[PDB]
Amino acid sequence: TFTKACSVDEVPPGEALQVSHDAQKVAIFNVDGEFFATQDQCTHGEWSLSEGGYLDGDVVECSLHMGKFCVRTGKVKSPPPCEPLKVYPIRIEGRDVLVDFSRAAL
């Protein structure tokens, strides 16, 4: 069920705001105009990717161990992470940004 995790302004270009649906912390990023929502926790040492991390393009870097992933598929672009990020479907419906905390692919 799609549920509105934020606004299209809370999360601006090249930035990123977590979203804590239930206890389903979810990483939201804006890349040049497109939104891609991922699992907020780094698969290596479960550090927060939206808070503290560095999105360069569509690449999120981990500040803890400086590991790197793709925000569109959740695929590691650089270890230490061994596992890909699962990622959530995401709809924009005007000024609101929809995530269905189910169907989170991996």
Binding site: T43, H44, G45, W47, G52, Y54, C62, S63, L64, H65, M66, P79, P80, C82, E83
Partner: protein, 402 residues
């Protein structure tokens, strides 16, 4: 000059990181990788974390996906190589020819000789065999005695606690983590550890055991149902000294990973290289090194206009309520502090300086400072002393700008 065939001895993190840069830099010649362990190469750091918990060897698997058309020979030992024949004898009877040979055989743990014959179990923790074994020994109502107060004693202590084991810890130094942590952090962390259910014994010694009870030098008795020895690792350079290469508990290598032996390279824990920060040839026991020296060496092998390894040392430790990152030197003539050094909300950074220049820096639960201090390190910067201590200062605009 990189000449096929390429043969690597050891299938650890350095191996893996090494051959991916071989191919994923355009080298599609023959590669063979030998490892004396039987299992897909696995990341080591997660052993001290997750693994005691949800004991999954399947999420800590080194994913050698970036190394296509590599030959792995796992469960096979290398007994010897011949620098004059340019071959390696393996345990299963086979001969490996080489134009280029890479030693990346890591380091082994130096067990207890005083706990030579203990009626109780003891493990030195360095693999996904030992891992599985301690972990599964970690029951709720139980005892465990760790010997040594470095990162493995501390990291494993922490989860032993989360386990529900009443943990105590023998330390021969008057401090924990003498090898590579500022004293402030060490003194912090021990105080961290006391306030959790871990019983610390600095300055002491394991003189022996009795039946089911430990024996500190002070005659002390300790009922331990399980013991863990993390007294440190020694290089496995055995095949190296055997064949005449330069070795002093570790194999010496220059900036491209060259040994004193033509056609033979060396990477990772097994090696002794320059610390540009100190100028001394040290063994550098970090993941960080394991990988990046890995990469820097296989790309220079494929592109010689390219530089040799130059990066600066740094590592992490994730013990309990403390995500710690340490970079460069542990020692300075001045120390600067930021944040709140509390055992319940710890979130800070230490900066170590030497006549003004940053020689090092730690971060406890403060990742956002790490990267920018490391780059400051990398250019040996001497920033404004007062600004560095000004919490309104963000170290990123400082790192980034000038």
């Amino acid at each position: 000059a990189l000449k096929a065939p390429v043969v690597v001895l050891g299938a650890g993190l350095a191996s893996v990181s090494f051959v991916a840069e071989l191919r994923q830099a355009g080298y599609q010649g023959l590669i063979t990788v030998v490892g004396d362990e039987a299992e897909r190469p696995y990341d080591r750091p997660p052993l001290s974390k997750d693994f005691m918990a949800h004991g999954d060897a399947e999420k800590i698997r080194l994913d050698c996906k970036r190394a296509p058309e590599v030959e792995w020979l796992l469960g096979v030992t290398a007994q010897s190589f011949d620098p004059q024949a340019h071959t390696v004898a393996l345990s299963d009877g086979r001969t490996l020819p080489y134009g280029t040979l890479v030693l990346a055989t890591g380091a082994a743990p130096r067990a207890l000789p005083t706990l030579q014959g203990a009626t109780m179990p003891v493990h030195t923790l360095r693999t996904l065999e030992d891992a599985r074994r301690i972990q599964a020994g970690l029951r709720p109502q139980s005892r465990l005695l760790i010997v040594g107060g470095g990162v493995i004693g501390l990291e494993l202590a922490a989860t032993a606690r989360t386990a529900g084991v009443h943990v105590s810890l023998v330390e021969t130094q008057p401090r924990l983590m003498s090898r590579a942590a500022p004293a402030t952090l060490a003194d912090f962390v021990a105080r961290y550890h006391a306030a959790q259910g871990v019983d610390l014994r600095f300055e002491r010694s394991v003189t022996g055991s009795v039946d089911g009870v430990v024996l500190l030098d002070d005659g002390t008795r300790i009922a331990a149902d399980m013991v863990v020895v993390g007294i440190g690792v020694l290089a496995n350079d055995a095949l190296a000294r055997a064949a005449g290469l330069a070795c002093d508990d570790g194999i010496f290598v220059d900036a491209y990973g060259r040994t004193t032996c033509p056609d033979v390279y060396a990477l990772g824990d097994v090696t002794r290289q320059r610390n540009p920060l100190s100028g001394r040839f040290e063994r550098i026991e970090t993941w960080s090194n394991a990988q990046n020296q890995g990469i820097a060496v296989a790309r220079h092998l494929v592109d010689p206009t390219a530089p040799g390894y130059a990066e600066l040392p740094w590592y992490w430790s994730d013990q309990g309520a403390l995500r710690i990152q340490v970079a460069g030197l542990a020692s300075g003539d001045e120390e600067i502090v930021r944040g709140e050094v509390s055992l319940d909300a710890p979130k800070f950074t230490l900066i170590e300086l030497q006549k003004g220049r940053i020689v090092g820096a730690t971060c406890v639960n403060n990742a956002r400072d790490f990267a920018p201090l490391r780059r400051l390190l990398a250019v040996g910067a001497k920033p404004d002393r007062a600004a560095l201590a000004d919490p309104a200062t963000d170290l990123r605009k400082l790192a980034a700008a000038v």
